[PDB]
Amino acid sequence: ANIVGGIEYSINNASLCSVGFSVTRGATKGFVTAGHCGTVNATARIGGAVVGTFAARVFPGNDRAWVSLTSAQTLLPRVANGSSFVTVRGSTEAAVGAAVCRSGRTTGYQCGTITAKNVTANYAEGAVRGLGQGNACMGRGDSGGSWITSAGQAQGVMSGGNVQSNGNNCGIPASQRSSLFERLQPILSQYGLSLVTG
Numbered sequence: 001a002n003i004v005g006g007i008e009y010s011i012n013n014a015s016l017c018s019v020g021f022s023v024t025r026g027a028t029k030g031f032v033t034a035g036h037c038g039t040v041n042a043t044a045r046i047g048g049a050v051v052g053t054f055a056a057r058v059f060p061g062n063d064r065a066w067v068s069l070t071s072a073q074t075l076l077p078r079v080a081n082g083s084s085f086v087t088v089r090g091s092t093e094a095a096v097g098a099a100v101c102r103s104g105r106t107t108g109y110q111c112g113t114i115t116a117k118n119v120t121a122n123y124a125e126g127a128v129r130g131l132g133q134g135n136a137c138m139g140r141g142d143s144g145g146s147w148i149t150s151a152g153q154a155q156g157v158m159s160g161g162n163v164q165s166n167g168n169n170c171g172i173p174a175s176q177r178s179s180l181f182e183r184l185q186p187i188l189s190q191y192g193l194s195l196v197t198g
Contacts, residue, residue, distance in 0.1 A: 001046040003031050003069065005079030005088070005146030005154075006103025010045045011038040011054075018104035018145030020157035021088060021184070022075040022196035025055075029069040032187050033144035034157050035059030036125070038067075056191055060126035063159040064187045065144075077198030079146040079154075081109040087198045089152030091184050100134050100149055102179070104142030104158055106167070111150075112136030112174055121160050121180050131180040132156055138179045139168030147181040154195060156181035 003022045010016055017037035023030045035057040038044070042054045044067045051073055057065035069075075078085040080103050094100060094114055101111040112135040119131045134147070138161045147155040161179040162169050169177045188195065 001049060001051050002074045002076055004076050004085070005148070006105065006109065007046065007080055008105035009051065011042050013045065016105060016141050017143050018141065018158065020144050020146055021154055022077065023066065023188070023193040024075070024196065025191065025193050029071060029073050029075050030055065030066045030193065031069065032064070032066050032157055032184070032193065034159055034182065035063045035065040037144045038065060060123060060128050062130070063128045063182045064157070064190070066187070066191050066193060075196045077196045079103045079148050086148055086150070087152050088148065088154055088195060089197055090154070091188065091195055092153040093183070093185060094149055094153060094155060098149065100136065100147055100155055102136050102138060102142070102145060102147045102158055102181070104138065104145030106139040106141035107137060107170060110136040110138065119180060123160060128159060130183065131159055132183055134179050134181065135174040135177045136179055137168060137170035137177055139163055139170065154184050156184045157187070
C-alpha cells in the first residue's frame with residue numbers, strides 16, 4: 001500500500017483509525033499514529049491487506065504509537081487533502097494562534113487554528129496530558145491522523161475531541177470545539193524515528 005497521512009487503516013480487523021505520518025527507523029519503514037488505536041503486535045491492514053504491526057505504543061498518559069511496516073509498503077511524504085496532497089516538509093512546532101489542518105478517514109481534511117497547549121484529556125482509560133488543542137473539527141475514526149500546517153510542518157497526531165451525538169464536532173461552532181493532538185516531536189524521539197519529507 002501507499003502510506004499517506006490521513007488514510008484509513010484497520011487494527012486486528014476491528015477498529016479503524018487514520019495514518020499519521022510516514023517515518024523510518026533505520027531500514028524499517030513505519031507510520032506514526034495514536035496509541036489508543038492499537039496494542040503492541042496488533043495487525044494493521046490497508047485495502048484489506050496486512051501492511052504491518054504495532055511496534056510500540058503509550059496510552060493513556062500519552063497517546064502515541066508507531067506501526068512497523070513490511071518492506072513492500074511505499075512510504076510517502078504526503079498527507080491527504082481530498083483527492084490531492086499536502087507535502088510533509090518538516091516538523092517545526094507552530095505556536096498557539098497558528099493556522100493548522102488535520103486529515104483523517106471520517107471528516108477528511110479540516111482546518112482551524114491552534115488554540116492551546118499542554119491540555120489534559122480525561123478519557124475512559126485514564127488521563128492523557130500534554131496535548132495540543134485546535135478548533136478544526138474532527139470525528140470518531142479520525143484518531144491517529146495527521147495534524148499539519150498548510151506549509152507542510154507536521155504538528156502531531158489526532159488523539160480526541162469533544163465529539164457530539166453525531167460522532168463529530170463539525171456541527172458546533174469553532175469557538176466551542178476542542179480537538180486534541182499528541183505532539184509529534186516526542187513520538188519521533190521516543191522511538192528514534194525520522195519523518196519522511198519531500
